[PDB]
Coordinates of C-alpha atoms and ligand atoms in Angstrom, one line a residue:
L5 CA 7.1 -7.0 -5.7
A6 CA 10.5 -4.6 -4.3
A7 CA 12.5 -3.6 -1.5
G8 CA 10.1 -2.2 1.0
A9 CA 7.3 -3.3 -1.3
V10 CA 4.3 -5.6 -1.0
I11 CA 1.2 -6.4 -2.7
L12 CA -1.8 -7.2 -0.8
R13 CA -3.9 -9.4 -3.5
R14 CA -7.6 -8.8 -2.6
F15 CA -6.3 -7.7 1.2
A16 CA -9.8 -5.1 1.6
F17 CA -12.0 -8.2 -0.6
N18 CA -14.4 -8.0 2.4
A19 CA -14.5 -4.0 3.3
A20 CA -14.8 -2.9 -0.5
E21 CA -18.4 -1.8 -0.3
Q22 CA -18.3 -0.2 2.6
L23 CA -15.4 2.0 1.1
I24 CA -17.1 2.0 -2.3
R25 CA -20.1 4.0 0.3
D26 CA -17.9 6.3 1.3
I27 CA -16.1 7.6 -1.6
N28 CA -19.5 7.7 -2.6
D29 CA -20.0 10.1 0.2
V30 CA -16.4 12.6 -0.4
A31 CA -17.4 13.0 -3.4
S32 CA -21.0 14.7 -2.3
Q33 CA -19.1 17.0 -0.3
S34 CA -15.9 17.4 -2.6
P35 CA -16.4 15.8 -6.3
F36 CA -14.8 14.2 -8.7
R37 CA -12.9 16.3 -10.6
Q38 CA -10.3 15.5 -14.3
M39 CA -7.7 18.1 -12.7
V40 CA -5.6 20.2 -14.7
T41 CA -1.9 19.5 -14.7
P42 CA 0.6 22.6 -14.3
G43 CA 1.7 22.2 -17.9
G44 CA -2.4 22.9 -19.1
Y45 CA -3.3 18.9 -20.1
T46 CA -7.1 17.8 -18.7
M47 CA -6.0 14.5 -16.4
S48 CA -7.6 11.4 -18.3
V49 CA -8.2 10.3 -14.4
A50 CA -10.8 12.4 -12.3
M51 CA -10.0 12.4 -8.3
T52 CA -10.6 14.4 -5.6
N53 CA -9.4 13.9 -2.4
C54 CA -10.2 13.8 2.1
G55 CA -8.1 13.9 4.7
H56 CA -6.6 17.4 6.0
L57 CA -4.6 17.3 3.1
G58 CA -5.7 17.3 -0.6
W59 CA -3.2 16.7 -3.9
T60 CA -4.4 19.6 -6.0
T61 CA -2.9 20.8 -9.6
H62 CA -2.0 24.6 -9.2
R63 CA 0.2 26.8 -12.3
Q64 CA 3.4 26.4 -10.9
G65 CA 3.2 22.7 -10.1
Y66 CA 1.7 20.0 -8.2
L67 CA 0.7 20.2 -4.5
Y68 CA -1.1 20.4 -1.1
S69 CA -4.4 21.6 0.0
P70 CA -5.5 21.6 3.0
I71 CA -9.0 23.8 0.6
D72 CA -10.4 22.0 -2.6
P73 CA -9.8 24.4 -5.4
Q74 CA -13.1 23.8 -6.9
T75 CA -15.3 23.4 -4.2
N76 CA -13.6 26.2 -2.0
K77 CA -14.0 24.5 0.7
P78 CA -12.2 22.0 3.4
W79 CA -11.8 18.5 2.2
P80 CA -13.6 16.0 2.9
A81 CA -12.7 14.2 6.8
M82 CA -11.0 11.1 6.5
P83 CA -13.5 7.7 6.8
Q84 CA -12.6 5.8 9.6
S85 CA -13.1 2.9 7.7
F86 CA -10.8 4.4 5.4
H87 CA -8.5 5.4 8.9
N88 CA -8.8 1.9 9.7
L89 CA -8.3 -0.2 6.3
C90 CA -5.0 2.3 5.5
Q91 CA -3.5 1.1 9.1
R92 CA -4.2 -2.2 9.1
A93 CA -2.3 -2.6 5.3
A94 CA 0.3 -0.5 6.1
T95 CA 1.6 -2.6 9.8
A96 CA 0.6 -5.9 7.5
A97 CA 2.9 -4.2 4.5
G98 CA 6.4 -3.8 7.9
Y99 CA 4.7 -0.2 8.2
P100 CA 3.3 -0.3 11.6
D101 CA 3.6 3.4 12.5
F102 CA 1.8 5.3 9.1
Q103 CA -0.5 8.3 9.3
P104 CA -1.7 9.4 6.7
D105 CA -2.5 12.9 6.9
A106 CA -4.3 12.5 3.1
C107 CA -5.7 10.0 1.0
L108 CA -6.1 11.0 -2.8
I109 CA -8.8 9.3 -4.3
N110 CA -8.9 8.0 -8.2
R111 CA -11.2 7.4 -10.5
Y112 CA -10.6 5.7 -14.0
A113 CA -13.2 5.8 -17.0
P114 CA -12.4 3.0 -19.7
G115 CA -9.6 4.2 -21.4
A116 CA -8.4 6.3 -18.8
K117 CA -3.9 6.0 -17.9
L118 CA -1.8 8.0 -15.5
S119 CA 1.8 8.0 -17.0
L120 CA 4.8 7.1 -15.2
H121 CA 5.9 9.2 -12.1
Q122 CA 6.8 9.7 -9.0
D123 CA 5.1 10.4 -6.0
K124 CA 7.5 13.3 -4.8
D125 CA 5.8 16.0 -3.4
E126 CA 5.6 14.4 0.2
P127 CA 8.5 15.3 2.6
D128 CA 8.6 12.6 4.9
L129 CA 10.0 9.8 2.8
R130 CA 9.6 7.1 6.2
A131 CA 6.0 6.9 5.2
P132 CA 5.2 4.5 3.0
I133 CA 2.6 4.8 0.4
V134 CA -0.9 2.3 0.6
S135 CA -2.7 2.3 -2.4
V136 CA -5.8 0.3 -2.8
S137 CA -7.9 -1.0 -6.3
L138 CA -11.5 -1.2 -5.9
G139 CA -13.7 -2.1 -9.6
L140 CA -12.2 -2.7 -12.9
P141 CA -8.8 -4.3 -13.4
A142 CA -5.5 -2.6 -14.2
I143 CA -2.5 -3.1 -15.3
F144 CA -0.2 -1.1 -12.4
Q145 CA 3.5 -0.1 -14.0
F146 CA 6.2 -0.2 -11.2
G147 CA 9.5 0.4 -12.4
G148 CA 12.6 1.6 -10.6
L149 CA 14.5 5.6 -9.8
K150 CA 14.8 6.1 -13.6
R151 CA 11.9 6.5 -15.9
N152 CA 13.6 4.0 -18.4
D153 CA 14.6 1.6 -15.6
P154 CA 13.2 -1.7 -16.2
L155 CA 9.1 -2.1 -15.5
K156 CA 7.2 -4.5 -13.6
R157 CA 3.9 -4.8 -15.1
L158 CA 0.9 -6.2 -12.6
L159 CA -2.7 -7.4 -12.9
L160 CA -4.4 -4.8 -9.7
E161 CA -7.4 -6.4 -9.3
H162 CA -10.8 -5.6 -6.5
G163 CA -10.0 -5.8 -2.9
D164 CA -5.7 -4.9 -3.9
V165 CA -3.5 -3.7 -1.5
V166 CA 0.1 -2.3 -2.8
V167 CA 2.4 -0.9 -0.2
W168 CA 5.9 0.9 -1.8
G169 CA 8.0 2.8 0.5
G170 CA 11.4 3.0 2.5
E171 CA 14.0 1.5 -0.6
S172 CA 10.9 1.5 -3.5
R173 CA 9.6 4.8 -1.9
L174 CA 10.2 7.1 -5.0
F175 CA 9.9 4.3 -7.8
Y176 CA 8.8 4.9 -10.7
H177 CA 4.8 3.7 -11.4
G178 CA 1.2 4.2 -13.1
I179 CA -1.9 2.1 -14.3
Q180 CA -1.6 1.8 -18.0
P181 CA -5.1 2.8 -20.5
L182 CA -7.9 0.8 -18.6
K183 CA -10.1 -1.2 -20.0
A184 CA -13.7 -2.0 -20.6
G185 CA -15.4 -4.0 -18.6
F186 CA -18.1 -4.2 -16.1
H187 CA -17.6 -4.7 -12.0
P188 CA -21.0 -5.1 -10.1
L189 CA -19.7 -2.7 -7.4
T190 CA -18.5 -0.2 -9.1
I191 CA -20.1 -0.5 -12.6
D192 CA -18.1 1.2 -15.4
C193 CA -14.7 2.7 -13.7
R194 CA -12.0 1.3 -11.2
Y195 CA -11.4 3.2 -8.4
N196 CA -8.0 4.0 -6.1
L197 CA -7.4 4.9 -2.9
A198 CA -4.1 6.8 -2.6
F199 CA -3.1 6.9 1.3
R200 CA -0.1 9.9 2.3
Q201 CA 1.0 11.2 5.0
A202 CA 2.5 14.6 2.9
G203 CA 2.4 17.3 5.5
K204 CA 4.8 16.4 8.6
Ligands
AKG301 O1 -4.3 4.5 -9.8 C1 -3.1 3.3 -9.7 O2 -3.4 2.2 -8.2 C2 -2.1 4.4 -9.5 C3 -2.6 6.3 -8.4 C4 -0.8 6.6 -8.2 O3 0.3 6.3 -9.1 C5 -1.5 8.0 -7.7 O4 -2.1 8.5 -7.1 O5 -0.3 8.7 -7.8
CO302 CO1 1.4 7.5 -7.7

């Protein structure tokens, strides 16, 4: 895909049913919620987290916290299925030592989008992003280090895993408004699992 980045198409297909069961379990403790940006806007993507650290919005900016600010309880632990799939994908992608401490779970309803951004809240740039697609298909934009650097547009379908790191660790990326559709395992949405090393 780029220097240090790869798409492992359908890599998570066999694991997907189990991953979705575990999403449901995570969400039972820390429900999906549409977070409000530091600038005051409700995101169209609904999110939750598992693992030690959860990505959250705050008045002062984006940040990681071990506490879910909605439930005021810790985030649920990382499911075994998540851990195992992430490790295998990272290894296949050339990042054998990846040990995530954070998984952001994104839910896209039809029309939901995540505009171009960098994943720039993690101090240790040696660790890649491992990004798992489940359910409805989406167009993923993958750019460069500047907002106006040319974008690649890639369809991501159920089971696809994108990994970026090294040279491409800070590349701009996003998801275009989700097209309407049906998927037998997620019904009416796309999920994304975004694994990160957010701490030291
Ligand atoms: O849904 C995706 O594939 C991308 C999500 C994303 O970029 C993020 O969680 O920062
Ligand atoms: Co991102």
